[PDB]
RNA sequence: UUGCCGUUGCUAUGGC
């Protein structure tokens, strides 16, 4: 199960890769991928600009789960839910948070590269 | 203790002999020790020891079983005709050697 | 076989300390061939499920894949479903080899023992002497793991330390 | 090659019992106490957020 | 509700009594009440079986108790000479114990028969 | 215009359309067993090889059923054994995982195009899929 | 419907292999085949012989001289017989004796004339596996098996050993060891008109024997449990039945290889079955069969069930559910401990605890149209196969055998249309394996020898 | 008709 965010989305959008088929072929398994009501938050916020990426994160085969804190900063959460529990993947693509990610240990994190996914700390992919 | 198998048995009249399959099972033994399985199948089958003959040995992996070719005479004199001469020197009697130059 | 994509990194050297340490191995390379092949099946697995039901590539050549890794013995007799093969992984078919199997059926002490046992031929699946702990049974050839008839903790004659240590104290 | 790898697992599975706190199988015996101390200031549990 | 209430039907009482004839060809088997009742309190069993159809039943009624208490699944077979035939002791058993062990060859099986008597139970 | 006898078109083919998820199919809904080994029989060099897989042992099988049949073992020669056997070891080892050939699922060879989708009762018309039907 | 495009394009399938009755229809490959079988030679073991003795509904039945000879042995448990082409039988017990029988007197009861009892004496003073050719059995003997020729009798049993009598003397001739710590042998068959058998061990083992020449000629490997039971006839094939992995094979013994039949009855679509208008149920273990001939058999199951299996089907032809009844529910004043009825009634749970009696013992007269099966239901049960042999059926019962009846098997005489048999069966009050039999209802330890005629 | 023991038959049964 994969926690995306919102560059995520964006540049799966900007490379064409489904999410749920992208994931599938990254890791050659089945993946769950959550989006967060801060990650929500964030591509709602993003305006009408990107109602594309909105309309493809409301997704029925995208599940989602529920945050429970103030104010819509989706790297605190991801982080937080992430360093709590150790069994999430992190779907991401911003620099900060793909650092952050990275340094805490034991979680494996995927982001767009090239034409389809990439998937670094999970150390069973073929 | 050596066990002897023939299977499929046939008969050639133009040739004058019979012929067939010949499982040889020696468990804890090396091998089919060929003069041994001879005299054994020349009891099993009537006397002719030097009318009966075995060629083709393969003994499978981990030993016990290796499958062979059978075929017994009647007539001594008429299987030193039928049979090859290379045969003949590993068994029984013939020997020409080939003149060895160039 | 074929190196991985990243070969270097902290969890997949952790992921290898544990794999050959619980599993007794020699080197990458078990691991390697034995994922290798993994990645080929699940692979496969993913396109027969990235195509539709009814399709005939997927009815047949799924039953096919998921009978022929229960009868690999991955696979359980009950978990019928394609998504069982991409939930497989590489210590559930590294569980199958003869060395792990001599040791949880007991005929060894550890993994290491059940290595030196089957490489001195103390170890028979069926009627053939196995000698190569890397093996794979199957889950029929799974309850025919014995002792070797021909080997001195099977019943056989006992082998040369203990005959000289006996013709020795004989003297 | 072998035997450096059972020997370095070892070690591993050694300096596990330092960073975690490793289930060894349950209570062997009769319970004898804590063996090794009971710190009433610490606390090692993951608070959330 | 009988005393011994959980039983099993047919089906899975084979699956149960295949996983118990191989787990005592593995040695993880401990077979008898109180040798079941000994690896109870110790902790060491991972489903307990008893056969509803001694000569008393409070016999072996004494370790669903001790299985509530410790959280372990038990069920319960309806033949005591099947159950030690399965054992594979020339006696019927009426009750036996699966003890844990993870290097173990049918934890699988072992699991899968644990799911299936706990959705039961 | 005239006939000319042609052996490639009455010889028996059998093997453009023999696929193995179709065979295994068939045999688990054959309701007749199978002749399957004692269970060490098949395994080949103590396991330095594979198990042996099920073309191989009916291609053993046909070896020894003509070696019995004509009183001859067969040989070593060269250029067929260092194509067939060689390469046939390699990708028995690159895709034989006990007893089992896996190589298949990793393979482009489309089903129903060949094998399944009959040519012959093709029934391009309405009254002929009728009749055949009914 | 998936499963319908299954079938559907298997079925295309099928009809494309074909394509990659006329007045000339002669091949070439299988007339030349044809030629060759006309000059081989050896028409003799190999017979695919089907069924040629029709007359099950012919003899009578309910009208037996059964005569129950009880000896003094603890737990008979197998029964060996000959008839050349006078007749002696052989039976062993659980106190390690053999013992030879005359039994040619027909009209009468078997007359016992020799012993041959082993015992603590003759454990090895060794403790080591193929150190194990001692003269005698030292734990208990579990199977008998006459030479078809009648020169020696081979016994064995839990002390892994093979022991070859002689006939005339009941002395051991030779001791074979089985050189393993669990190769406890389970059944003996020698294939018929032969020196060669066919013992069934416990290491999931098929041992084979050449007797005369006291060589071992083939171990065959491939149940998944105890190979409980073993059959042969005049061909080299055989049929052993492992106990719990609940399958059947067939073993051609010189190809090794084996036909593998399982069970699979369900009592999910069982009571579906019977829903569409019943204490029926799934299967504990297969037991004993009997080649009935070389395309057809029999087993005995766990829970009651006798099935008729041929060369050509995985799954059974024929079942036969309940064969020997049901078991007697253990009684109020045995079950609970309570004091009212109500409770201990409460206590049976109904019908669910109902356990059917097992047949442990069938015996397929060989080609013949009856077999007969036997457990502790005190009644023999003799069944006759249907001449188009997809089904058999009671005939008529036997009800002279109190006890467990640990071997059946028949005695002929009379010529080609007129028969009269002695159908001979251990009778004990303990099954041949371990105990596990409780309520012993009027049981003895004897021989139930029946003499049917016609 | 057997390891004992009981009815036994002048042969069948039943308790360990
Ligand atoms: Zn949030």
Same mark, same amino acid.
């Given at each position: 199960?994969?926690?995306?965010?919102?560059?995520?989305?964006?540049?799966?959008?900007?490379?064409?890769?489904?999410?749920?088929?992208?994931?599938?072929?990254?890791?050659?398994?089945?993946?769950?991928? &959550?989006?967060?009501? =801060?990650?929500?938050?964030?591509?709602?916020?993003? !305006?009408? *600009?990107? $109602? @594309?990426?909105?309309?493809?994160?409301?997704?029925?085969?995208?599940?989602?789960?529920?945050?429970?804190?103030?104010?819509?900063?989706?790297?605190?959460?991801?982080?937080?839910?992430? &360093?709590?529990?150790? =069994?999430?993947?992190?779907?991401?693509?911003?620099? !900060?948070? *793909?650092? $952050? @990610?990275?340094?805490?240990?034991?979680?494996?994190?995927?982001?767009?590269?090239?034409?389809?996914?990439?998937?670094?700390?999970?150390?069973?992919?073929? | 203790?050596?066990?002897?198998?023939?299977?499929?048995?046939?008969?050639?009249?133009?040739?004058?002999?019979?012929?067939?399959?010949?499982?040889?099972?020696?468990?804890?033994?090396?091998?089919?020790?060929?003069?041994?399985?001879?005299?054994?199948?020349?009891?099993?089958?009537?006397?002719?020891?030097?009318?009966?003959?075995?060629?083709?040995?393969?003994?499978?992996?981990?030993?016990?079983?290796?499958?062979?070719?059978?075929?017994?005479?009647?007539?001594?004199?008429?299987?030193?005709?039928?049979?090859?001469?290379?045969?003949?020197?590993?068994?029984?009697?013939?020997?020409?050697?080939?003149?060895?130059?160039? | 076989?074929?190196?991985?994509?990243?070969?270097?990194?902290?969890?997949?050297?952790?992921?290898?300390?544990?794999?050959?340490?619980?599993?007794?191995?020699?080197?990458?390379?078990?691991?390697?061939?034995?994922?290798?092949?993994?990645?080929?099946?699940?692979?496969?697995?993913?396109?027969?499920?990235?195509?539709?039901?009814?399709?005939?590539?997927?009815?047949?050549?799924?039953?096919?894949?998921?009978?022929?890794?229960?009868?690999?013995?991955?696979?359980?007799?009950?978990?019928?479903?394609?998504?069982?093969?991409?939930?497989?992984?590489?210590?559930?078919?590294?569980?199958?080899?003869?060395?792990?199997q001599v040791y949880k059926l007991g005929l060894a002490k550890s993994?290491?023992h059940a290595?030196?046992?089957?490489?001195?031929?103390?170890?028979?699946?069926?009627?053939?002497?196995?000698?190569?702990?890397?093996?794979?049974?199957?889950?029929?050839?799974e309850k025919?793991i014995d002792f070797?008839?021909?080997?001195?903790?099977?019943?056989?004659?006992?082998?040369?330390?203990?005959?000289?240590?006996?013709?020795?104290?004989?003297? | 090659?072998?035997?450096?790898?059972?020997?370095?697992?070892?070690?591993?599975?050694?300096?596990?019992?330092?960073?975690?706190?490793?289930?060894?199988?349950?209570?062997?015996?009769?319970?004898?106490?804590?063996?090794?101390?009971?710190?009433?200031?610490?606390?090692?549990?993951?608070?959330?957020? | 509700?009988?005393?011994?209430?959980?039983?099993?039907?047919?089906?899975?009482?084979?699956?149960?009594?295949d996983v118990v004839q191989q787990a005592a060809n593995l040695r993880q088997l401990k077979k008898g009440?109180?040798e079941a009742?000994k690896t109870?309190?110790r902790?060491i069993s991972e489903?307990?079986i008893?056969?509803?159809?001694?000569?008393?039943?409070?016999?072996?009624?004494?370790?669903?108790?001790?299985?509530?208490?410790?959280?372990?699944?038990?069920?319960?077979?309806?033949?005591?000479?099947?159950?030690?035939?399965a054992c594979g002791v020339?006696?019927?058993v009426?009750?036996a114990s699966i003890t844990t062990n993870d290097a173990s060859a049918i934890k699988?099986q072992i699991?899968?028969?644990?799911?299936?008597?706990?959705?039961?139970? | 215009?005239?006939?000319?006898?042609?052996?490639?078109?009455?010889?028996?083919?059998?093997?453009?359309?023999?696929?193995?998820?179709?065979?295994?199919?068939?045999?688990?809904?054959?309701?007749?067993?199978?002749?399957?080994?004692?269970?060490?029989?098949?395994?080949?060099?103590?396991?330095?090889?594979?198990?042996?897989?099920?073309?191989?042992?009916?291609?053993?099988?046909?070896?020894?059923?003509?070696?019995?049949?004509?009183?001859?073992?067969?040989?070593?020669?060269?250029?067929?054994?260092?194509?067939?056997?060689?390469?046939?070891?390699?990708?028995?080892?690159?895709?034989?995982?006990?007893?089992?050939?896996?190589?298949?699922?990793?393979?482009?060879?489309?089903?129903?195009?060949?094998?399944?989708?009959?040519?012959?009762?093709?029934?391009?018309?309405?009254?002929?899929?009728?009749?055949?039907?009914? | 419907?998936?499963?319908?495009?299954?079938?559907?394009?298997?079925?295309?399938?099928?009809?494309?292999?074909?394509?990659?009755?006329?007045?000339?229809?002669?091949?070439?490959?299988?007339?030349?085949?044809?030629?060759?079988?006309?000059?081989?030679?050896?028409?003799?073991?190999?017979?695919?012989?089907?069924?040629?003795?029709?007359?099950?509904?012919?003899?009578?039945?309910?009208?037996?001289?059964?005569?129950?000879?009880?000896?003094?042995?603890?737990?008979?448990?197998?029964?060996?017989?000959?008839?050349?082409?006078?007749?002696?039988?052989?039976?062993?017990?659980?106190?390690?004796?053999?013992?030879?029988?005359?039994?040619?007197?027909?009209?009468?009861?078997?007359?016992?004339?020799?012993?041959?009892?082993?015992?603590?004496?003759?454990?090895?003073?060794?403790?080591?596996?193929?150190?194990?050719?001692?003269?005698?059995?030292?734990?208990?003997?579990?199977?008998?098996?006459?030479?078809?020729?009648?020169?020696?009798?081979?016994?064995?049993?839990?002390?892994?050993?093979?022991?070859?009598?002689?006939?005339?003397?009941?002395?051991?001739?030779?001791?074979?060891?089985?050189?393993?710590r669990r190769?406890?042998?389970?059944?003996?068959?020698?294939?018929?008109?032969?020196?060669?058998?066919?013992?069934?061990?416990?290491?999931?083992?098929?041992?084979?024997?050449?007797?005369?020449?006291?060589?071992?000629?083939?171990?065959?490997?491939?149940?998944?449990?105890?190979?409980?039971?073993?059959?042969?006839?005049?061909?080299?094939?055989?049929?052993?039945?492992?106990?719990?992995?609940?399958?059947?094979?067939?073993?051609?013994?010189?190809?090794?290889?084996?036909?593998?039949?399982?069970?699979?009855?369900?009592?999910?679509?069982?009571?579906?079955?019977?829903?569409?208008?019943?204490?029926?149920?799934?299967?504990?273990?297969?037991?004993?069969?009997?080649?009935?001939?070389?395309?057809?058999?029999?087993?005995?199951?766990?829970?009651?069930?006798?099935?008729?299996?041929?060369?050509?089907?995985?799954?059974?032809?024929?079942?036969?559910?309940?064969?020997?009844?049901?078991?007697?529910?253990?009684?109020?004043?045995?079950?609970?401990?309570?004091?009212?009825?109500?409770?201990?009634?409460?206590?049976?749970?109904?019908?669910?605890?109902?356990?059917?009696?097992?047949?442990?013992?069938?015996?397929?007269?060989?080609?013949?149209?009856?077999?007969?099966?036997?457990?502790?239901?005190?009644?023999?049960?003799?069944?006759?196969?249907?001449?188009?042999?997809?089904?058999?059926?009671?005939?008529?019962?036997?009800?002279?055998?109190?006890?467990?009846?640990?071997?059946?098997?028949?005695?002929?005489?009379?010529?080609?249309?007129?028969?009269?048999?002695?159908?001979?069966?251990?009778?004990?009050?303990?099954?041949?394996?371990?105990?596990?039999?409780?309520?012993?209802?009027?049981?003895?330890?004897?021989?139930?020898?029946?003499?049917?005629?016609?």
């Amino acid at each position: 199960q994969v926690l995306i965010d919102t560059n995520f989305i964006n540049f799966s959008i900007q490379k064409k890769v489904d999410i749920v088929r992208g994931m599938m072929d990254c890791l050659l398994a089945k993946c769950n991928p &959550l989006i967060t009501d =801060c990650v929500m938050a964030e591509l709602e916020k993003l !305006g009408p *600009k990107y $109602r @594309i990426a909105l309309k493809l994160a409301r997704d029925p085969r995208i599940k989602r789960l529920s945050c429970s804190h103030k104010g819509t900063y989706a790297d605190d959460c991801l982080v937080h839910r992430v &360093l709590q529990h150790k =069994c999430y993947i992190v779907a991401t693509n911003d620099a !900060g948070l *793909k650092q $952050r @990610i990275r340094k805490i240990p034991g979680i494996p994190l995927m982001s767009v590269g090239g034409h389809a996914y990439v998937i670094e700390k999970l150390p069973d992919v073929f | 203790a050596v066990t002897i198998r023939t299977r499929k048995v046939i008969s050639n009249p133009l040739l004058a002999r019979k012929q067939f399959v010949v499982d040889v099972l020696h468990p804890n033994r090396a091998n089919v020790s060929k003069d041994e399985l001879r005299e054994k199948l020349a009891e099993v089958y009537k006397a002719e020891k030097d009318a009966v003959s075995v060629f083709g040995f393969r003994t499978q992996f981990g030993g016990g079983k290796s499958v062979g070719f059978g075929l017994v005479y009647n007539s001594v004199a008429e299987a030193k005709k039928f049979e090859p001469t290379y045969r003949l020197v590993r068994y029984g009697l013939a020997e020409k050697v080939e003149k060895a130059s160039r | 076989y074929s190196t991985p994509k990243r070969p270097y990194e902290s969890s997949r050297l952790d992921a290898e300390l544990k794999l050959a340490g619980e599993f007794g191995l020699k080197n990458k390379k078990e691991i390697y061939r034995i994922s290798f092949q993994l990645s080929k099946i699940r692979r496969a697995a993913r396109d027969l499920l990235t195509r539709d039901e009814k399709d005939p590539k997927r009815l047949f050549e799924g039953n096919a894949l998921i009978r022929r890794l229960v009868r690999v013995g991955v696979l359980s007799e009950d978990k019928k479903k394609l998504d069982y093969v991409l939930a497989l992984k590489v210590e559930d078919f590294l569980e199958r080899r003869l060395q792990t199997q001599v040791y949880k059926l007991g005929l060894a002490k550890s993994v290491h023992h059940a290595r030196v046992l089957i490489t001195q031929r103390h170890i028979a699946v069926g009627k053939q002497i196995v000698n190569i702990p890397s093996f794979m049974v199957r889950l029929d050839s799974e309850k025919h793991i014995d002792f070797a008839p021909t080997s001195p903790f099977g019943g056989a004659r006992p082998g040369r330390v203990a005959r000289r240590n006996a013709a020795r104290k004989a003297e | 090659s072998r035997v450096k790898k059972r020997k370095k697992y070892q070690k591993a599975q050694k300096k596990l019992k330092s960073v975690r706190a490793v289930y060894s199988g349950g209570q062997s015996g009769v319970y004898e106490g804590e063996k090794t101390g009971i710190k009433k200031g610490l606390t090692r549990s993951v608070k959330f957020k | 509700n009988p005393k011994a209430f959980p039983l099993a039907d047919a089906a899975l009482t084979q699956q149960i009594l295949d996983v118990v004839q191989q787990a005592a060809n593995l040695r993880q088997l401990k077979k008898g009440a109180n040798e079941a009742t000994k690896t109870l309190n110790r902790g060491i069993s991972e489903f307990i079986i008893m056969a509803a159809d001694c000569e008393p039943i409070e016999i072996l009624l004494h370790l669903p108790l001790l299985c509530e208490d410790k959280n372990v699944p038990y069920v319960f077979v309806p033949s005591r000479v099947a159950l030690g035939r399965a054992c594979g002791v020339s006696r019927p058993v009426i009750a036996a114990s699966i003890t844990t062990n993870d290097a173990s060859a049918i934890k699988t099986q072992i699991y899968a028969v644990k799911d299936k008597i706990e959705t039961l139970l | 215009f005239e006939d000319r006898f042609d052996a490639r078109e009455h010889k028996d083919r059998s093997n453009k359309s023999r696929m193995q998820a179709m065979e295994e199919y068939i045999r688990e809904s054959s309701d007749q067993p199978d002749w399957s080994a004692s269970i060490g029989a098949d395994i080949v060099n103590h396991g330095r090889g594979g198990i042996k897989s099920l073309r191989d042992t009916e291609k053993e099988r046909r070896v020894t059923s003509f070696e019995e049949d004509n009183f001859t073992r067969l040989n070593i020669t060269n250029k067929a054994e260092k194509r067939k056997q060689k390469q046939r070891e390699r990708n028995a080892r690159m895709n034989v995982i006990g007893g089992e050939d896996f190589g298949i699922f990793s393979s482009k060879r489309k089903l129903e195009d060949s094998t399944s989708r009959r040519g012959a009762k093709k029934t391009r018309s309405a009254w002929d899929r009728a009749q055949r039907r009914l | 419907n998936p499963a319908d495009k299954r079938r559907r394009l298997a079925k295309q399938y099928l009809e494309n292999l074909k394509s990659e009755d006329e007045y000339n229809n002669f091949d070439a490959g299988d007339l030349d085949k044809d030629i060759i079988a006309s000059r081989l030679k050896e028409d003799v073991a190999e017979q695919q012989g089907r069924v040629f003795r029709y007359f099950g509904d012919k003899l009578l039945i309910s009208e037996a001289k059964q005569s129950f000879t009880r000896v003094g042995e603890n737990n008979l448990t197998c029964i060996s017989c000959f008839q050349p082409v006078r007749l002696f039988a052989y039976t062993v017990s659980k106190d390690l004796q053999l013992t030879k029988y005359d039994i040619t007197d027909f009209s009468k009861r078997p007359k016992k004339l020799k012993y041959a009892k082993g015992g603590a004496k003759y454990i090895p003073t060794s403790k080591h596996e193929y150190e194990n050719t001692t003269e005698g059995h030292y734990d208990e003997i579990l199977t008998v098996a006459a030479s078809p020729d009648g020169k020696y009798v081979v016994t064995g049993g839990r002390d892994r050993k093979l022991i070859v009598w002689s006939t005339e003397s009941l002395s051991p001739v030779k001791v074979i060891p089985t050189k393993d710590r669990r190769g406890e042998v389970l059944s003996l068959a020698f294939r018929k008109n032969s020196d060669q058998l066919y013992a069934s061990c416990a290491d999931f083992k098929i041992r084979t024997y050449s007797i005369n020449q006291f060589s071992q000629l083939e171990i065959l490997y491939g149940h998944h449990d105890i190979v409980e039971d073993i059959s042969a006839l005049a061909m080299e094939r055989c049929v052993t039945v492992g106990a719990r992995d609940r399958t059947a094979m067939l073993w051609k013994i010189p190809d090794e290889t084996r036909l593998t039949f399982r069970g699979g009855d369900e009592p999910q679509k069982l009571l579906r079955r019977w829903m569409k208008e019943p204490l029926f149920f799934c299967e504990g273990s297969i037991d004993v069969v009997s080649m009935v001939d070389d395309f057809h058999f029999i087993t005995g199951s766990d829970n009651g069930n006798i099935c008729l299996w041929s060369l050509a089907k995985k799954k059974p032809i024929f079942t036969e559910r309940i064969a020997h009844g049901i078991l007697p529910e253990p009684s109020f004043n045995d079950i609970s401990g309570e004091t009212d009825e109500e409770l201990r009634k409460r206590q049976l749970q109904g019908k669910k605890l109902l356990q059917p009696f097992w047949i442990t013992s069938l015996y397929a007269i060989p080609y013949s149209n009856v077999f007969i099966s036997g457990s502790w239901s005190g009644s023999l049960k003799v069944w006759k196969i249907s001449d188009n042999l997809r089904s058999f059926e009671l005939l008529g019962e036997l009800s002279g055998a109190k006890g467990v009846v640990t071997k059946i098997q028949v005695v002929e005489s009379g010529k080609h249309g007129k028969e009269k048999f002695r159908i001979l069966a251990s009778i004990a009050k303990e099954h041949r394996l371990g105990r596990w039999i409780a309520n012993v209802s009027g049981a003895r330890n004897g021989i139930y020898s029946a003499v049917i005629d016609q």
